[PDB]
């Protein structure tokens, strides 16, 4: 979904509020190959500490599901950078898969990543996503075996998102091994969420074959600290990571 060498910011919708999120997106767009917008959830058990706290913040401040769509829709007026909605299944399930995906599209979403999509539902979900015009993004962690990477690559229409709960401050070996395995298997492009915090991380990861590098925790850490005034600090952290 993005150019090779792309940096992909991840932001939590409504952290600290929907207007600020929108502001952060507009400020980072010029460096983005694509953007992951996370829908906060009460039990984000698949995320690392930093991102989990951002979900807590967003929810405490009163985030409401469709505000995520408001954000995408407003962003669309200014830019066409691909946006991938990242969510837990619960919200989608409760709202009705097709309804959600349909609403997602109408607002401008290009792709969707369902963190904990039950395998039992993968098939129908992907079919509906295709019908509704939304590209799929599936996640794989270091404990994902080659056979599953393949099943994942065959269902993916957007890109494969490789993650590492490991944290770091070096990229863990197990993260690199996942990347190496994926490139040897995936036809789709792959993006990596290995918690980059330094310029050397971005350089290395792209050099090792990542088509794109997601930058989430780094960005979210500044937002948890600066609140609405995070903007400028965000632009500096991305420039730092890009060597500019």
Swiss-Prot record:
Q: Spell out the reaction equation it catalyses.
A: (1S,2R)-1-C-(indol-3-yl)glycerol 3-phosphate + L-serine = D-glyceraldehyde 3-phosphate + L-tryptophan + H2O
Tell me which SUPFAM superfamilies the record gives: Ribulose-phoshate binding barrel
User: Which Gene3D superfamilies does UniProt cross-reference here?
Assistant: Aldolase class I
The answer to whether the entry has keyword Lyase is yes
Name this protein carries in UniProt: Tryptophan synthase alpha chain
Q: What PANTHER family does its record include?
A: TRYPTOPHAN SYNTHASE ALPHA CHAIN, CHLOROPLASTIC, TRYPTOPHAN SYNTHASE, ALPHA CHAIN
Pathway in which the depicted protein is active: Amino-acid biosynthesis; L-tryptophan biosynthesis; L-tryptophan from chorismate: step 5/5
Q: Where is the active site?
A: 36, 47
Q: Which gene encodes it?
A: trpA
Question: What is the species of this protein?
Answer: Pyrococcus furiosus (strain ATCC 43587 / DSM 3638 / JCM 8422 / Vc1)
Q: Which GO terms describe its molecular function?
A: tryptophan synthase activity
Per its database record, what is this protein's job? Answer: The alpha subunit is responsible for the aldol cleavage of indoleglycerol phosphate to indole and glyceraldehyde 3-phosphate.
Q: Which family does it belong to?
A: Belongs to the TrpA family.
Query: Which chain positions lie within coiled-coil regions?
Result: none
Query: Which CDD domains does the protein's record reference?
Result: Tryptophan_synthase_alpha (cd04724)
One GO CC term on file = cytosol
Q: Which UniProt keywords apply?
A: Amino-acid biosynthesis, Aromatic amino acid biosynthesis, Lyase, Tryptophan biosynthesis
Q: Which InterPro entries match?
A: Aldolase_TIM (IPR013785), RibuloseP-bd_barrel (IPR011060), Trp_synthase_alpha_AS (IPR018204), Trp_synthase_suA (IPR002028)
This entry's Enzyme Commission designation comes to 4.2.1.20
Subunit annotation: Tetramer of two alpha and two beta chains.
């Amino acid at each position: 979904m993005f150019k090779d060498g792309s940096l992909i910011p991840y932001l939590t919708a409504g952290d600290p509020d929907k207007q600020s999120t929108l502001n952060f997106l507009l400020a980072l767009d010029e460096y983005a190959g694509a953007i992951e917008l996370g829908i906060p959830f009460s039990d984000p058990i698949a995320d690392g500490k930093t991102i989990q706290e951002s979900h807590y913040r967003a929810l405490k401040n009163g985030f409401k599901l469709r505000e995520a769509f408001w954000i995408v829709k407003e962003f669309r007026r200014h830019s066409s950078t691909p946006i991938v909605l990242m969510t837990y299944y619960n919200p989608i399930y409760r709202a009705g898969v097709r309804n959600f995906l349909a609403e997602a599209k109408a607002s401008g979403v290009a792709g969707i990543l369902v963190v904990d999509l039950p395998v039992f539902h993968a098939k129908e979900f992907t079919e509906i996503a295709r019908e509704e015009g939304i590209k799929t993004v599936f996640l794989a962690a270091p404990n994902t075996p080659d056979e599953r990477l393949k099943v994942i690559d065959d269902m993916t229409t957007g890109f494969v998102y490789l993650v590492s709960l490991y944290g770091t401050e070096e990229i863990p070996k197990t993260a690199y091994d996942l990347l190496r395995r994926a490139k040897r298997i995936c036809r789709n492009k792959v993006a990596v969420g290995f918690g980059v915090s330094k310029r050397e991380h971005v350089v290395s990861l792209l050099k090792e074959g990542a088509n794109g590098v997601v930058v989430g925790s780094a960005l979210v850490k500044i937002i948890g600290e600066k609140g609405r005034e995070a903007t400028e600090f965000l632009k500096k952290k991305v420039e730092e990571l890009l060597g500019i």
